[PDB]
Symmetry: D2
Subunit: 481 residues, 4 copies
């Protein structure tokens, strides 16, 4: 048994009735419990994430099967058997909190590893590529895909306008409009790092790496019809599924694989290996097994742990570095930037975001300082040998720059259509039919000029792809061939 | 033709490429356009409303048919033909911003009248009563109805626990579980002030008043099955429907009626006329036509106008005053309170919230001061005849207090069951079948003890109601009768 | 030895140099440590208190000498020898952080008692009365006294405009323009609760109470000349003094006394005993010793503990209640209100604000949720016996209301001038001279009409006081006499 | 004559009395005017600037005397006679908003030019160099100089610890401990850009440029004793002086001069021309007159204009670019960053901050959206020829990068002591005496080892400097010599 109390620790005598002039009269201002309780209610909500607002979290463990020390000095990957606690959030992308989990979208796949050398965030999606290759375009891309700013309804005429005029999107669209654009749930779903990262070993040698998560539960996707049926009865089916699996003891798991490429292979390829619109051939750069992640624990409070969770691709640990990918480069900034807004200057003290590794630095103050700070010395250099010092063992590498000037210029070898054509041709006939069906339903009402340009981009990827789409939309494209 | 610019008004040379070390190198910190564009994008979102997060807005006009000067000095009601501009937001209640408009819930019906004596907000719902009668219970009621704080899914076991232990909810539930708990859209929907207010005329005479909005399009509802069919294909059907009606010139309208009651009828009744769990008899207190509101204009920007709209029941105008309704009394506080959090201290300067009537006072400063203030004098009293002064013509009435002590006590004659029974009996057989169906689907999984208490509360309302529900749920209630 | 780390727990390899293109080139965006460090630095500051911005804090203990159980059931006062931890903040009033502590002003004297029945804040000042008697005037009073909104300099012509037109200020100004308007430091200074409160014993019997703190170090003040001498060399002399006393083991202390008055004495006094412009006679209501507060510990971190401290007069504990004082009644609302803005919705979880008594309630979420919440049940009533419940032993009293209407009306017996005259006459000749000197220096540059009305108010208090001031200012008052 | 109104535009009937239970009872919650008025009062304050919190603003005009088109394509400098409106804020640095203007500190000298090609901020100080040369050290430097985080008093032992271990500070300290560390006021004060910037002309040719403002009122400094004598009687003397000059029509003015250096002079020098701890010789790089700025208009409201003013060194206009100065590079980020926190995401819409040039871009939403946005198209590229487009005529230059790796490394030729010695020797004997006097008063109580290292740094600058200081401090340095 417990007393209901105010926030001052005073027990509440009556949690039913406001304080009033007799039994039916108007209310008094001197009702601290009423005002405190309403005022805190009135302040429950914080801004939702600007994208990936709808999602679900769980905790688990990552266990290494094969040490990666030949390629990275990352502590959490150093030894067979080594276990690292994770927190993972899965999500949709475009619509707000409360939106259905039956909509076409990439799905987020964000993993926070609580390592002995700091938190490592691998902030992935299910699909292995992206629509754009420079962060400068992200707000434009997002705005195009978001509900129209007048109507509050998503409009394919808007996002296809953007995408058609951004032909580097063609590969991504060739995946997103497969039925893998609507995963069945968060467990039966792929995971990808998307970007090339740099792995640096004990000798200082660097390789490029890509990360892949393969679900133990296999990949299951929904057709448009299957998605509609689920939407009719449950707008939160994936959130429900994840919680329920774990509550029943049916823990979902993913194997982690990497591809590795020498830096020197840039020069021989017909694409830029750090263009995130590109994959790497699994023939030429085979998947290498790293380990397994198992999610086995629901959070205790959805708001405090899942809603407040903060991931950033710049949360890198020794041995794992950013590549020069210009999309990634902007992410390094945007995540901690948004999070200071969404969660507060001290968001890294919120429990789910705290490292297991010790934190010692000269930062101070900010809204909601809860950490009981002490001491006179908040500056370095200082004369005190016991105060925190820099540690040169933990310097990052020094990537070689191939450019000579500060420029705003597209990467060389953009090669916008080739891989989209390869993906198309890798599709089974059924999968090619689903792709065309899903494209057609999406494009059939868009502006004719934008429609034609979409067809043209897909035709440039593969003639049979473009032509099939034209046939299905009833567009004759002979005069242009 | 126009230049794309920074916020400093500098034209942007390249909105495609970040600034980098050659065409494929990493990105530079000296890229003001990138950082400004991403930093603003990173800050687009503000907290959603704590309830009624999902909604849609329109502008229109209200026109008086019958002047109401005999009963209220309210300027906007003073002459036949008098037109007042309005802004209206409709909404659901419980789920977040992107949630479906096919869920069971009261619907919000919030009308802002831009009058010559200030803005008047009549913050209504479709249903004419409420679940509770004291604001002190609102955060509890809401928390019970909201998604579970661990799972992020609404749980009938939690809200029926609260409602069954809060038997004054029995009338509301008798309406909410009719098919009117899912209006077909926002146009074919009832509107109600819910609370009793006080109207005061120019002689200082007071009457109790209730407000009712009657849709020109008629009232139409959805069965559970009809709602699921809509949900399968559109999770923003009501938002879509409202925008489309107005865009095509098919403007939805409502007629405004009032009921009027003398304060001296309190002892005539077997309920408290200011208990918002109660309606008033239309036989004994007939509906009196006031005028008609037509919605004829969509907003230009959903975020700036609909999302940032701020209504409060305390935005009262001379001649229209609060009643003593303890639920209403807390609303007077909570709305401006939550708005200062959600929107900023200066939220009343956001265009949609601005009065048409002049504003002049001694308030100053606060985040985002955009109004070009001037002058030395920001205090009253002062020696300057030209500075703003109080105007005693605009004093509010002085309601008589019947109580002689500051108390926390339930009203007398709560009468929790009788009107629920009267409503039940007023239903057609088809409507009674829908009600029992809807209740049964909602109750069939809840804790048995809570299920029995639900049945008991409805049985106390009407024996046939309670027994039918018991029969439909398979609960034998013989031992209690 | 300790590593300097990022907030992610990664050790820092170089805390001297930004990451750049060669040893002298421009900076890269991929410098997480730079950006994290700068971004936190960029967010150190929170809004200063709207008043009392300049101040200093210490911890200590309060020990009861005489148990007060005959007059209040307050747990912390229930037994001889009972010790309660305190946190105290002293302050000036009008000027910002960084302003000198040699300015004329009331001094704040805010004491937070960490009791077994919750936190109790007694938010006092040194001087025992106030300028105004209704909270509606507070922002006007403050705006008049604050630096002019154009010039950013305080202007006596502004505040004397307000004060002269607010004659209830006359008693306060007769204290504030004694040399007690500049205490020598925070230790050699009076403390006062200012308002009448209600004390309620275990039989439910109520008395009016006033609180007084008497410094063990004596009361010492500064002339205008002595203040200027200090100001030349130290603008934080009182903060310095407090810290230095405690660091040296010279702990300052104050004895707590109360005056007690029966509620029934209202009716035969020639002033309202709950008018905070009035004191109570120490002959007719003698001071009764309660106990002693000793300050013996400096905070570990000024920002986290002193700057973020939050006191409210509405933080009352069982047995101690507000009176009807209309000034106090607004304070009940304003403090938690401003603190939610200044510090966050969860400001009551900042360590210095946390009670020692357990907190258990159904509030949730809000910015910077750091408390590791758990459980499914965040609403009451609920079916669970183990969840927090109200406790009727802790209900507040039910004060009798003497009025029968909701009114806006000044109190009866305002008696604006009599106690100002009594205070004047109680001064020594030297003290009278200082008063007239201090007033003259303040008034000599104000608008002539305002200057005359000041003189008139002081003359109404005492004809010698007013005539001496008129003579000292060179104002001929013959035509009025 | 005007009515006092609420923010809803309703005239206030009584601005003196709260609404209460009779004339002397407690206050009612239903008092919208009370609550709105207090709640706005409660939210007046915003965070002060993290440095340069104390300051004062004025408006004026900058007129070109000599067109600079041969060296920069900057539009505001393109023609003799061309006039540009400015806003200027002057400041101290370390202490908070209300702190005295008599303290030793650089003084801020921030100029916003409202040009036809966007706002250009030149965010200078009076002194022409800085303490440090890499932004990564700025939070350390500041934290050392700021009041101790326990005591809230500045401690020379803390900042001398930092500075002695940061010997690049030696030049700066040799200026700051001259009497120029305390300017007499803001009019009789130097101004400096401090950094090297890049000027780029219409042919794309780049020169390095340094900016200097020369007061029409001449330079006047205060001794420590003169500063104390002013501090005794006025803590806002420089704010007062500036307002009062302009109010009287005695408008202060500064002539703007530049020095210009070819990029190729790098190897001609024994320092780095982009090391902000260095000046350039006026013999070798003579001052060239550009024009004159006159301040002639005080602001209408100090909060709205001066307090909410936002300047950033990254507010550059075509033809003026950042240099590679690593201090400046961090500033490019930190200002807008801090401003988003201090003022809100939309701070660029606060009137003082708004450009005169048109702003058109695809940014949207954020707290306090007041600008009446409209339209469907908030993304680029898009198919609409009338929507804003990039303009290649306004591309920035492409500076050449000399380094071939991403490094963290000190510049070559840091040369920490030579220019400090040159400055020392340039001082008159009276100025040298003041310097030694000021240093000795500052150093006499610091840790002996720190004190000796200070002496050593100054001795390395000039033997006579160091020896005189050692003598004055009573430190025997024979035996290090
Ligand atoms: C320039 C490109 C991108 C930018 C600028 C960007 C920016 C952001 C921002 C600001 C957030 C909100 C973070 C928060 O509020 O905590 C977010 C969320 C997210 N983004 Fe990105 N994003 C980009 C591309 C991508 C890519 C390529 C992926 C995956 C590879 C991705 C995956 C995610 C995920 C999974 C989340 C949700 C994190 C969570 O669960 O809390 N984004 N993004
Ligand atoms: C209606 C009249 C008054 C109002 C509306 C008012 C309002 C406020 C507010 C809003 C603050 C800032 C609190 C914070 O941010 O934590 C404050 C501080 C303060 N007020 Fe008042 N006040 C009033 C009268 C008085 C009176 C009568 C006293 C003493 C009896 C007083 C003593 C103080 C003190 C000591 C502080 C500083 C507390 C601290 O150390 O943080 N005030 N006041
Ligand atoms: C007030 O909202 C609700 C009522 C009944 C069932 C579901 C809800 O979301
Ligand atoms: C950065 O300015 C300072 C230098 C020396 C002493 C005090 C200061 O605030
Ligand atoms: C050249 O060495 C020194 C000079 C002055 C003070 C201390 C030293 O170590
Ligand atoms: Cl640090
Ligand atoms: Cl707030
Ligand atoms: Cl006002
Ligand atoms: Cl609660
Ligand atoms: Cl921010
Ligand atoms: Cl843009
Ligand atoms: Na009429
Ligand atoms: Na006793």
């Amino acid at each position: 048994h417990k007393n209901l109390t105010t926030n001052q620790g005073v027990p509440v005598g009556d949690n039913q009735n406001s304080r009033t002039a007799g039994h039916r009269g108007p209310s008094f201002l001197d009702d601290y419990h009423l005002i405190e309780k309403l005022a805190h209610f009135d302040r429950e909500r914080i801004p939702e994430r600007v994208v990936h607002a709808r999602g679900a979290g769980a905790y688990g463990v990552f266990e290494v099967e094969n040490s990666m020390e030949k390629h990275t000095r990352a502590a959490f990957l150093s030894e067979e058997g080594k276990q690292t606690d994770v927190f993972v959030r899965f999500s949709t992308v475009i619509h707000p909190k409360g939106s259905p989990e039956t909509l076409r979208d990439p799905r987020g796949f964000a993993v926070k590893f609580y390592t002995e050398e700091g938190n490592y965030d691998l902030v992935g999606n299910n699909l292995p590529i992206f629509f754009i290759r420079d962060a400068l375009k992200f707000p434009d891309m997002v705005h195009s895909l978001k509900p129209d700013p007048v109507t509050n309804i998503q409009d394919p005429d808007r996002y296809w306008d953007f995408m058609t005029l951004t032909p580097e999107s063609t590969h991504m669209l060739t995946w997103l409009f497969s039925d893998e654009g609507i995963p069945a749930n968060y467990a039966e779903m792929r995971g990808s790092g998307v970007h090339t990262f740099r792995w640096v070993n004990k000798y200082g040698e660097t390789k490029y790496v890509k990360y892949h998560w393969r679900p133990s539960e296999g990949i299951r996707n929904l057709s448009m019809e299957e998605a509609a049926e689920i939407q009719a009865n449950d707008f939160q089916h994936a959130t429900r599924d994840l919680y329920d699996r774990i509550e029943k003891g049916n823990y979902p798991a993913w194997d982690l694989y990497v591809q590795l490429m020498p830096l020197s292979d840039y020069d021989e390829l017909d694409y830029d290996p750090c263009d995130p619109t590109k994959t790497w051939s699994e023939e030429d750069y085979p998947l290498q097994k790293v380990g397994r992640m198992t999610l086995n624990r629901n959070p205790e409070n959805f708001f405090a742990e899942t809603e407040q969770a903060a991931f950033t691709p710049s949360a890198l640990v020794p041995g794992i570095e950013a590549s020069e990918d210009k999309l990634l480069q902007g992410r390094l900034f945007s995540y901690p930037d948004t999070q200071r807004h969404r969660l507060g200057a001290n968001y890294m003290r919120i429990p789910v975001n705290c490292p297991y590794a010790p934190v010692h630095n000269n930062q101070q103050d900010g809204f909601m300082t809860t950490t009981r700070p002490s001491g006179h010395i908040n500056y370095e250099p200082n004369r005190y040998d016991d105060q925190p010092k820099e540690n040169p063992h933990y310097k990052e590498s020094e990537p070689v720059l191939h450019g000579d000037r500060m420029v705003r210029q597209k990467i060389e070898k953009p090669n916008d259509f080739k891989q989209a054509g390869e993906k198309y041709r890798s599709y089974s006939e059924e999968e090619k039919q689903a792709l065309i069906k899903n494209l057609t339903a999406d494009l059939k009402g868009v502006n004719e000029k934008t429609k034609l340009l979409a067809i043209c981009n897909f035709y440039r990827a593969d003639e049979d792809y473009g032509q099939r789409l034209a046939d299905s939309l009833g567009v004759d494209i002979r005069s242009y061939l």
